[PDB]
């Protein structure tokens, strides 16, 4: 009765954007990217892949409250390196390992019988 | 298929008005119960 | 109060395995524990979801209504 | 190829045991996750009752309906709804299903997700059949009638995700295990004697070199190769629960990488 | 004419109509039994 | 799960568990007494009540 509905954990509300970009204010080079309809699938994943960067100097995500899908990510870079293209890298790097993970998979299944 | 209300005991498909009085006919018990809406239902299978 | 399809903890289907698990107690004079593993029921989530079951369809099914 | 590495110890039509090598912790947790909740599937989201003269009321059947298993090969080829241009439901979005069952014998009438019927129009697509793994070919016992009973009953079945409902979760249990030895101390066991003795040793360990009293501890030892295996309900081949859910993944990836894409004009 | 003595369902209750018993009484006064079924899910702060 | 609290699995929840039937009746009578004026069941509309 006062249970929000299943969908509100992956569709995005009204007006609502998936991310939002704020600036940190107690660092220099930092920021908080708040993911919106998102959970630990995401969060845990793009912050271990911000943590094999070596120009990330930190990189953090956090839930704030279970009932609510959305997590914050800050992130601090070096200099003259934009945390938005540390994040980009990132993800392109995450979807090159699965891309190898799907083929790789894949050639051994049909090496596989029954 | 047009029903008003169902024997409880022999499951009789009666049909009657206020001034008629309940009890079964060819039965005689005096329940009665009735009949699904022909409204139709829907569910969310969860 | 039939079978659960899928067993709450893991949901692996168990609502067809009943009937089969019945049969391998009677027919097959097997043992509950053996009856489940050959109807590979391996995790205790999953025997438990017929090991506990409590058929009570049966008795419902019993009144005329 | 490079990256995250594979090697398949057993498989079969409804589960895969593997070896992931090369892989951080995060991605191995992140597709077993995504594998639970993140892959669509096609299951019964909507009951229209025309008769339920059963011991059973008409939201328990309802209930069970969801939970039946229906083929979800061809599922990328079928619109969510929410997004389907249709009022309500259509065949581009949706399958329907029907259940008309009438006791005839004197003896128990049982209800079988056989006895359900695809009334839709499949258009060539592997979807909604439901999935029968059952030796005598019945496949989930829906209810059981007695005699005067009868239960007439149309079904939309639309896409969804477990996320949503447990209903649309095409995989069971997923088995995941990473450093059977504990060579990296990322446990604690509990004992009263002896830590060897009391906890029973892994399967996995066979797998891998056992530790060695004579050697420290490797501080720079990271987690790194996962003993995984993967389970299928029926609604999706188990080889497709894997590439689905690597795929869903990376999916959902890229959406991020687009959002800043989109972000960074007006 | 007529005043109201009309049921209403329980304020906070909801669900579906499951059985209607109309019946005569031991002094033959027509009466009814009204049947309302629900099903609980286990909510939130549910007891166990 | 603190203080006499719980954790519950959402996902055991929608496949069945712990979920039960709630079953109310309601019941009323035609009037207690009247010779003539009697209590009655119907639909009701205007009729000035
Ligand atoms: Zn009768
Ligand atoms: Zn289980
Ligand atoms: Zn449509």
């Known amino acids: 009765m006062n249970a929000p509905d299943r969908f509100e954990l992956f569709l995005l509300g009204e007006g609502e954007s998936k991310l939002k970009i704020d600036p940190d204010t107690k660092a220099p080079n930092a920021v908080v990217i708040t993911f919106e309809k998102e959970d630990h699938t995401l969060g845990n994943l793009i912050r271990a892949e911000l943590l094999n960067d070596r120009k990330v100097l930190f990189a953090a995500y956090k839930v704030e409250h279970p009932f609510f899908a959305r997590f914050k990510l800050r992130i601090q870079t070096t200099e003259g390196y934009d945390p938005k293209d540390a994040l980009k890298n990132a993800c392109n790097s995450i979807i090159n390992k699965l891309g190898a993970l799907k083929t790789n998979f894949e050639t051994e299944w049909n090496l596989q019988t029954l | 298929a047009t029903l008003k209300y169902i024997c409880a005991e022999c499951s009789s498909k009666l049909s009657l008005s206020r001034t008629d009085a309940v009890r079964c006919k060819d039965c005689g ?10 409204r139709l239902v829907q569910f969310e299978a969860r | 109060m039939i079978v659960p399809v899928r067993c709450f903890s893991c949901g692996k289907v168990v609502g067809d395995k009943w ?22 029921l391996k995790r205790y989530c999953c025997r438990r979801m017929i090991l506990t079951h409590v058929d009570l369809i049966e008795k419902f099914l019993r009144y005329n209504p | 190829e490079e990256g995250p590495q594979v090697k398949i110890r057993e498989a079969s039509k409804d589960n895969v045991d593997f070896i992931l090598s090369n892989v951080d912790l995060a991605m191995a947790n992140s597709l077993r996750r995504v ?14 009752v025309e008769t339920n003269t059963t011991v059973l009321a008409d939201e328990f059947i309802a209930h069970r309906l969801g939970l039946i298993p229906l083929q979800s090969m061809d599922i990328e080829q079928l619109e969510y709804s929410r997004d389907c241009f249709c009022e309500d439901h259509c065949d581009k979005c949706s399958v329907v299903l029907t259940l008309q069952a009438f006791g005839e014998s004197e003896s128990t009438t049982n209800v079988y997700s056989k006895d359900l019927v695809i009334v839709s129009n499949l258009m060539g697509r592997n979807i909604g059949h439901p ?35 447990a209903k649309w979760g095409p995989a069971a249990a997923i088995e995941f295990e990473y450093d059977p030895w504990n ?5 604690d066991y509990w004992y009263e004697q002896d830590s060897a003795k009391e906890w029973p040793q892994s399967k ?22 996962f003993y995984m295996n993967v389970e299928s309900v029926g609604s999706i081949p188990v080889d497709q629960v894997v590439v689905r859910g690597i795929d869903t993944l990376q999916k959902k990836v890229a959406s991020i990488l687009l959002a800043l894409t989109q972000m960074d004009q007006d | 004419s007529k005043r109201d003595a009309s049921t209403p369902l329980r304020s906070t209750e909801n669900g579906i109509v499951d059985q209607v ?11 009814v039994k009204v049947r309302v079924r629900t099903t609980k899910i286990p909510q939130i702060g549910d007891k166990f | 799960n603190q203080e006499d609290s719980m954790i519950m699995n959402q996902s055991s929840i929608d496949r069945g568990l712990f979920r039960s039937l709630f079953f109310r009746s309601y019941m009323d009578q035609e009037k207690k007494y009247g010779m003539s004026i009697t209590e009655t069941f119907e639909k009701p509309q205007r009729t000035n009540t």
């Open chain 5, 21 to 31: 018993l109309v019946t005569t009484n031991q002094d033959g006064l027509k009466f």
């Open chain 4, 35 to 48: 594998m639970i909740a993140e892959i669509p599937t096609l299951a019964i989201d909507s009951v229209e």
């Open chain 4, 204 to 225: 996995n360990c066979e797998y891998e070199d056992p530790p060695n009293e004579g050697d420290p501890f490797d501080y720079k030892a990271q987690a790194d190769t």
């Open chain 4, 183 to 187: 060579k990296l101390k990322h446990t």
């Open chain 3, 19 to 40: 009937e089969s698990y019945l049969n391998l107690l009677q027919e097959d004079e097997l043992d509950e524990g053996t009856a489940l593993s050959r109807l590979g």
């Open chain 4, 131 to 165: 999935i029968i793994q059952d030796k005598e070919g019945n496949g989930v016992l829906i209810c059981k009638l007695r005699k005067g009973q009868e239960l007439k009953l149309t079904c939309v079945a639309k896409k969804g995700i477990a996320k949503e409902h």
């Open chain 2, 29 to 38: 018990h005096r329940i009665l119960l009735k009949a699904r809406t022909k």
